[PDB]
Design a protein around this ligand. Structure first.
Ligand SMILES: CC(=O)N[C@H]1[C@H](O[C@H]2[C@H](O)[C@@H](NC(C)=O)[C@@H](OP(=O)(O)OP(=O)(O)OC/C=C(\C)CC/C=C(/C)CC/C=C(/C)CC/C=C(/C)CC/C=C(/C)CC/C=C(/C)CC/C=C(/C)CCC=C(C)C)O[C@@H]2CO)O[C@H](CO)[C@@H](O[C@@H]2O[C@H](CO[C@H]3O[C@H](CO[C@H]4O[C@H](CO)[C@@H](O)[C@H](O)[C@@H]4O)[C@@H](O)[C@H](O)[C@@H]3O)[C@@H](O)[C@H](O[C@H]3O[C@H](CO)[C@@H](O)[C@H](O)[C@@H]3O[C@H]3O[C@H](CO)[C@@H](O)[C@H](O)[C@@H]3O[C@H]3O[C@H](CO)[C@@H](O)[C@H](O[C@H]4O[C@H](CO)[C@@H](O)[C@H](O[C@H]5O[C@H](CO)[C@@H](O)[C@H](O)[C@H]5O[C@H]5O[C@H](CO)[C@@H](O)[C@H](O)[C@H]5O)[C@H]4O)[C@@H]3O)[C@@H]2O)[C@@H]1O
Ligand SMILES: CCCCCCCCCCCCCC(=O)O[C@H](COC(=O)CCCCCCCCCC)COP(=O)(O)OCC[N+](C)(C)C
Ligand SMILES: CCCCCCCCCCCCCC(=O)O[C@H](COC(=O)CCCCCCCCCC)COP(=O)(O)OCC[N+](C)(C)C
Ligand SMILES: C[C@H]1CC[C@]2(OC1)O[C@H]1[C@H](O)[C@@H]3[C@H]4CC[C@@H]5C[C@H](O[C@H]6O[C@@H](CO)[C@H](O)[C@@H](O)[C@@H]6O)[C@@H](O)C[C@@]5(C)[C@@H]4CC[C@@]3(C)[C@@H]1[C@H]2C
Ligand SMILES: C[C@H]1CC[C@]2(OC1)O[C@H]1[C@H](O)[C@@H]3[C@H]4CC[C@@H]5C[C@H](O[C@H]6O[C@@H](CO)[C@H](O)[C@@H](O)[C@@H]6O)[C@@H](O)C[C@@]5(C)[C@@H]4CC[C@@]3(C)[C@@H]1[C@H]2C
Ligand SMILES: *[C@@H]1O[C@H](CO)[C@@H](O[C@@H]2O[C@H](CO)[C@@H](O)[C@H](O)[C@H]2NC(C)=O)[C@H](O)[C@H]1NC(C)=O
Ligand SMILES: Cc1cnc(NC(=O)c2cc(S(=O)(=O)N(C)C)ccc2N2CCCC2)s1
Ligand SMILES: [Mn+2]
Lengths: 76, 33, 46, 112, 655, 110
């Protein structure tokens, strides 16, 4: 697999590969973020939250959304 | 070794499973996004 | 050039079991170098 | 030209060949049963003319049925015509695939 | 679920392909589970005895090789008369294992090489059909190829013949040609020339490849679709393929001076005469262009395939073999079930969308079908192409009925997938049954469990209890075995490359005792082996095929007194009872096939001396062979070996 | 009477054709001539060694055909039938095919 053995390099073909890889990173990040946010909301908001763990979960979700926005800007 | 009947039964089951799996593959093919 | 020379050295002396191995080696060297040079040429042409 | 007009010829030749026309012409078999029984007793390749043409015709139907079926699926077809066409195709398919099996069983008792 | 569409798709394609491969490799494995792994029938006994001599002794000591153990006075050359394809694929597969210290036997990698090459056929078929159309309709071909009953008959575990390994080469060559026509790359064409070379060296049916290709290009040239792709591909394949083909010593200078390979050449010259004209038209204008505007004949063998009656009239040896007669409605359906129906639908779907690749599949199917019609043995070529067509048709129907489903009218749409699944199942069942019951029976092990292994006991006796320089003479049918098991020097072999020596042997049989003894002295024959088969009920007795012996001995200059319509009775019926013709009751064949036989009680309530096969009593009840003293007679009287007596000592007329 | 058209055609083919393509035609003419000479000598004397002439003639027909194939693929105008076959991937293919051809020719000749 590590041997290219290609004489002519075409930009569109590599562009498609890179875009698909970015779309894979983004989809994995969205799945991880939904799983984290849902797990935190289910395990920290049962009967008592004290607005401490919820604030940390909101900060982590904001950081994840910021990283996803940065990746989207990079792909744009 | 292996009785002839046993081999025949195994062949039958494998063939039927392979054909059902091929049909399932056609269904998955059409359903592409 | 060596590959063509071999095509003549397999006439006088060699048999089809030693010429093939030599070709399997010289051809591989020729192929790898050729591919590299061809890639360079292609890039220059564009 | 007329690309289909060629598929018609090919199908006709296929019907003639799968009815063992070559066997009939080469080694003329009497088309009679010795009360007449159409099928040969046990020979894997023993063809009377009646066993041959009748079996072939079934294969040709077993093909035209599918062609009729696929053709019916075409859109913008009145429901009255589509239903009749699909019925004919299904009948030709099932009937050919059962009649051929029965014929094979009759020609070679002990089948399956 | 969580798996992406890509991963799921590829894991399904891989699963199905692997399953199909295993299925194919494990359905042509019946003759081995029942009886031990031994090569069977008349041909695989020569290929084996040759691959063995090529394994121990280097290739260079087999390309030229004079075998002085067949056609005793003459001697046949094995180095330049056989296609060295199977022997160099088996020797190589055995050497690689030895290099990996597997140390398998040469009689065990030579029996399981047909099923192994029917496990690579599946992959090649899947691709050859993933080229004409989508992958969707490629798998459905592989599995059907795996379990096609007609193909399985010629490739069971134990049939070491270049007929289960030929289909693979044909498929590979077709895949290469289809890729060359589709893309036009010089490399692809080359990789096709090489496949043809590896197919012209293993299968004698390579004239098909140098006659379907020109046909294909001619059609892709009469309808107006001849582009530079086909031109480049065809020309490259022609040049390289022909030059490679001439290498093989058996082919010699056939491709350039024969009327079988004149097609390719003609289409070559008509290819050029076309490309150049097109080029000229492009660079000119209508007005100016308007102003400017030894070879051998068709050998009888291959000609018999065109004229289906030529064999009967002229060649009295190609019509003998059972598998040389036109196919009936009971062979096509018996060997190919549900494929015969699918063939017209596959054709129609091709004709609907003509393309450069398809116009080749249609031509192949149209030709192969007729060739299978003429002779039952050709069913090799027919089954794979039919299977490919079937793969392209059922899948299309399924695809048409797979979109209608709401999940992807609904009741009608399902009714089709369900019917198709039922048809596929029925096909798998019938295929297993056909492989099991009938197309799997050991040739040298007559069985009814009771086992009759006389065909081996007599040969072993010969191999151990005769002088090391005997000359066992028997009908050309058993020549391959006697030289592989008995290990004697049989007078006639199975290649039948001399139609006068075989005629000689024929004359030596079905003749008076004197004439026979006189003919059995020039060749220095010592022993004589005749397959009686009368006491056991064997269908193929020597007497049963004695008509061919009388009809191939009285058709040469040396002998004509043996004219047919003389062993028959006044009413022309071949009766071997007491009312039969007197000459018949006196020929050497019958005299040595019923010696001291009119005493045994073969049946419960029948006359003593009865014959089970012909259901008639013997005529010459008691007689004494003048020249042939008995030497051995197997327990079931299935094979009797006599021994020509030497010239009388005192010089008397007799013996 | 039919020489004016021939001269016009040649003139056209001597301005409307790019360089590095005429050279291919020259080499092709060379092969066509070596082939013509081979065939002429064969006709003049006949063939005692048949495989000698046959493989010393195919070694030219095959080369000629490979050259024509390379000229076809290299030609920019004919870049619609061939998709994704760059000139370099054509030249390398030609070289490989030629190597096979010559090896087989050496094996076949005496
Ligand atoms: C029955 C029968 O027949 N049989 C056969 C057999 O068979 C068999 C087989 O074989 C087997 N097989 C095997 C493998 O084994 C088997 O088989 P099977 O089973 O079957 O299996 P398979 O095969 O595998 O499988 C099968 C399957 C099938 C096939 C399937 C099929 C399928 C299909 C599909 C098919 C198809 C079909 C078809 C038809 C196709 C078609 C298609 C289609 C589609 C259709 C369509 C159509 C069409 C047409 C199309 C069209 C198209 C289009 C497009 C259109 C077209 C268009 C156009 C435009 C066109 C154009 C036109 C134009 C152009 C005009 O089994 C079987 C059975 O069992 O076989 C056999 C064989 O073995 C055979 O036999 C043979 O034969 C032959 C022939 O014959 C002859 O003879 C005859 C008879 O008479 C005679 O004979 C007798 C007896 O003998 C006596 O007796 C009397 O007397 C007389 O004499 C005649 O007639 C004839 O004629 C002839 O002649 C023969 O030949 C052979 O013999 C041989 O062999 C033997 C044994 O081997 C021996 O012994 C002897 O002796 C001989 O030998 C010889 O030969 C060999 C080889 O061949 C060799 O080796 C040796 O040595 C010898 O040789 C010598 O001699 C010769 C003589 O000939 C010569 O030639 C040579 O020489 C050569 O060679 C060499 C080498 O080799 C070389 O060397 C040389 O060269 C040199 O010299 C020269 C001089 O000149 C020079 O030139 C040179 O150079 C040199 O070189 C040298 O040197 C130098 C210095 O110098 C150096 O350099 C170098 O290097 C060196 O090389 C040459 O020349 C010597 O000499 C017998 O026999 C049987 O038959
Ligand atoms: C998948 C493609 C390959 C399929 C392989 C199938 C095997 C077919 C081989 C059949 C043999 C045909 C006859 C033949 O090979 O000729 C043998 C030389 O004998 C050999 O060299 C046999 C080599 C077999 C492998 C060749 C690979 C083909 C690749 C072409 C570039 C004689 O050559 P030599 O005896 O070496 O010549 C000696 C004198 N000279 C001066 C001429 C050198
Ligand atoms: C069992 C034996 C039975 C004998 C049957 C013989 C048939 C076998 C030949 C199979 C060839 C199939 C290919 C084929 O049919 O091509 C089709 C239709 O167009 C044509 O092909 C026209 C010529 C048809 C014959 C060409 C080859 C004749 C025999 C080959 C030597 C393409 O037609 P198109 O050119 O695509 O349609 C254009 C028609 N217009 C009206 C638009 C002009
Ligand atoms: C003088 C004798 C010579 C031998 C023969 O009789 C006359 O001359 C043959 C004919 O050419 C016949 C074929 C015509 C084409 C036709 C194509 C179909 O497709 C196919 O189904 C039938 C087929 C092949 C005919 C069969 C009988 C043939 C072969 C005849 C032989 C019996
Ligand atoms: C003996 C074994 C060897 C493997 C095989 O036969 C059985 O012979 C292989 C070929 O080399 C095929 C490849 C060629 C290049 C081609 C590139 C395209 O892109 C596309 O067609 C796929 C690809 C890679 C072919 C795939 C199938 C292969 C591996 C074929 C198998 C069936
Ligand atoms: C078949 O019989 C031949 C004839 O004797 C055997 O050939 C002999 O093989 C031995 C090997 O041990 C050699 O020493 C002899 O020289 C061979 N004989 C001649 C005349 O050269 C052959 O071995 C036998 N095949 C077997 C036993 O499988
Ligand atoms: C009694 C026999 C049993 N089996 C035999 N062998 C052939 O009949 C046969 C052989 C070749 S061949 O390629 O080996 N040729 C020798 C170069 C080609 C075609 C052949 N038949 C196919 C249809 C009719 C002729 S003879
Ligand atoms: Mn064979």
């Amino acid at each position: 697999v590590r041997l290219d053995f290609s004489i002519t390099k075409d930009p569109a073909a590599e562009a498609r590969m890179k875009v698909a890889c970015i779309t894979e990173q983004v989809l994995t990040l969205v799945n991880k973020r939904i799983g984290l946010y849902r797990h935190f909301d289910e395990t920290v908001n049962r009967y008592k939250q004290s607005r401490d763990i919820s604030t940390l979960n909101s900060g982590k979700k904001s950081l994840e959304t910021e990283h996803k926005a940065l990746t989207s800007e990079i792909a744009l | 070794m292996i009785t002839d009947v046993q081999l025949a039964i195994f062949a039958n089951m494998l063939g039927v499973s392979l054909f059902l799996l091929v049909v399932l593959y056609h269904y998955v093919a059409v359903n592409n996004p | 050039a060596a590959m063509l020379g071999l095509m003549y050295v397999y006439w006088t002396q060699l048999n089809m079991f030693q010429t093939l191995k030599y070709l399997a080696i010289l051809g591989s060297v020729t192929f790898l170098a050729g591919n590299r040079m061809l890639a360079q040429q292609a890039v220059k042409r564009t | 030209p007329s690309a289909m007009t060629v598929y018609a010829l090919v199908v006709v030749s296929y019907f003639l060949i799968t009815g063992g026309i070559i066997y009939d012409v080469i080694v003329e078999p009497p088309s009679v049963g010795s009360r007449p029984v159409a099928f040969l007793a046990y020979r894997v390749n023993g063809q009377y003319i009646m066993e041959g043409l009748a079996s072939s015709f079934l294969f040709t139907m077993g093909g035209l049925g599918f062609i009729i079926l696929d053709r019916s699926n075409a859109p913008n077809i009145p429901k009255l015509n589509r239903f009749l066409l699909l019925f004919i195709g299904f009948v030709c398919v099932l009937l050919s695939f059962f009649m051929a099996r029965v014929f094979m069983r009759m020609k070679l008792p002990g089948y399956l | 679920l969580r798996l992406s569409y890509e991963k799921q798709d590829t894991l399904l394609k891989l699963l199905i392909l692997s399953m199909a491969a295993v299925l194919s490799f494990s359905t042509r494995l019946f003759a081995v589970l029942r009886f031990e792994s031994v090569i069977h029938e008349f041909d695989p006994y020569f290929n084996y005895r040759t691959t063995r001599f090529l394994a121990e002794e280097g290739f260079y000591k087999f390309h030229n090789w004079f075998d002085d153990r067949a056609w005793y006075p003459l001697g046949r050359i094995i180095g330049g008369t056989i296609y060295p394809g199977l022997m160099i694929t088996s020797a190589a597969i055995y050497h690689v294992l030895h290099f990996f210290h597997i140390t398998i036997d040469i009689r065990n990698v030579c029996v399981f090489l047909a099923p192994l090459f029917s496990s690579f056929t599946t992959i090649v078929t899947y691709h050859l059909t993933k080229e004409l159309k989508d992958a969707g309709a490629g798998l459905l071909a592989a599995a059907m190829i795996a379990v096609v009953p007609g193909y399985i008959s010629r490739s069971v575990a134990g049939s070491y013949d270049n007929e289960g390994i030929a289909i693979f080469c044909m498929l590979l060559t077709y895949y290469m040609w289809i890729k060359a026509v589709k893309t036009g790359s010089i490399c692809w064409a080359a990789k096709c020339a090489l496949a043809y070379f590896y197919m012209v060296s293993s299968w004698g049916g390579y004239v098909f490849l140098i006659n379907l290709i020109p046909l294909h290009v001619l059609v892709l040239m009469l309808t107006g679709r001849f582009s530079h792709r086909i031109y480049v591909a065809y020309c490259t394949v022609y040049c390289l393929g022909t030059i490679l083909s001439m290498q093989i010593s058996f082919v010699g200078f056939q491709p350039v001076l024969s009327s079988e390979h004149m097609a390719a050449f003609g289409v070559f010259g008509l290819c050029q005469i076309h490309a150049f004209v097109d080029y000229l038209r492009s660079k000119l204008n209508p007005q100016q262009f308007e102003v400017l505007f030894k070879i051998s004949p068709w050998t009888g063998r291959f000609y018999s395939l065109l004229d289906p009656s030529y064999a009967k009239n002229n060649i009295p040896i190609i019509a003998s073999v059972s598998e040389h007669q036109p196919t009936t409605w009971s062979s096509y359906y018996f060997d190919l079930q549900l494929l015969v129906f699918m063939f017209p639908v596959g054709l129609y779907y091709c004709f609907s969308n003509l393309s450069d690749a398809r116009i080749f599949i249609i031509m192949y199917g149209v030709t192969s079908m007729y060739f299978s019609a003429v002779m039952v043995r050709l069913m090799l070529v027919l089954a794979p192409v039919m299977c490919i067509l079937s793969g392209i048709g059922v899948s299309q129907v399924l695809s048409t009925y797979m979109k209608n489903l709401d999940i992807s009218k609904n009741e009608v749409a399902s009714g089709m997938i369900l019917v198709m699944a039922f048809f596929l199942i029925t096909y798998t069942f019938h295929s297993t049954w056909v492989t099991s019951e009938a197309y799997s029976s050991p040739s040298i092990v007559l069985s009814a469990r009771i086992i009759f292994d006389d065909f081996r006991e007599a040969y072993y006796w010969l191999r151990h209890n005769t002088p090391e320089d005997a000359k066992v003479m028997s009908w050309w049918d058993y020549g391959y075995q006697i030289t592989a098991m008995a290990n004697r020097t049989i007078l006639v072999d199975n290649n039948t490359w001399n139609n006068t020596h075989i005629s000689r042997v024929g004359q030596a049989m079905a003749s008076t005792e004197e004439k026979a003894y006189e003919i059995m002295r020039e060749l220095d024959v010592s022993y004589v082996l005749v397959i009686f088969g009368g006491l056991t009920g064997y269908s193929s007795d020597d007497i049963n095929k004695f008509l061919w012996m009388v009809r191939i001995g009285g058709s040469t200059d040396t002998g004509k007194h043996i004219k047919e319509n003389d062993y028959y009775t006044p009413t022309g019926e071949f009766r071997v009872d007491r009312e039969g013709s007197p000459v018949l009751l006196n020929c050497l064949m019958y005299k040595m096939c019923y010696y001291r036989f009119g005493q045994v009680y073969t049946e419960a309530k029948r006359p003593p001396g009865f014959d089970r096969v012909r259901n008639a009593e013997i005529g010459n009840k008691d007689f004494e062979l003048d020249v042939l003293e008995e030497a051995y007679t197997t327990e079931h009287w299935l094979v009797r070996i006599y021994k020509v007596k030497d010239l009388d000592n005192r010089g008397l007329s007799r013996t | 009477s039919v020489v004016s058209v021939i001269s016009r055609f040649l003139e056209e083919y001597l301005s409307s054709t790019p360089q590095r393509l005429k050279l291919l035609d020259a080499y092709l003419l060379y092969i066509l001539l070596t082939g013509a000479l081979q065939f002429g000598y064969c006709l003049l004397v006949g063939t005692f060694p048949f495989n000698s002439f046959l493989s010393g003639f195919i070694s030219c027909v095959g080369s000629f055909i490979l050259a024509v194939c390379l000229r076809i693929q290299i030609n920019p105008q004919n870049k619609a039938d061939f998709q994704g076959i760059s000139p370099e991937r054509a030249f390398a293919d030609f070289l490989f095919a030629s190597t096979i051809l010559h090896l087989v020719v050496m094996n076949f000749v005496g």
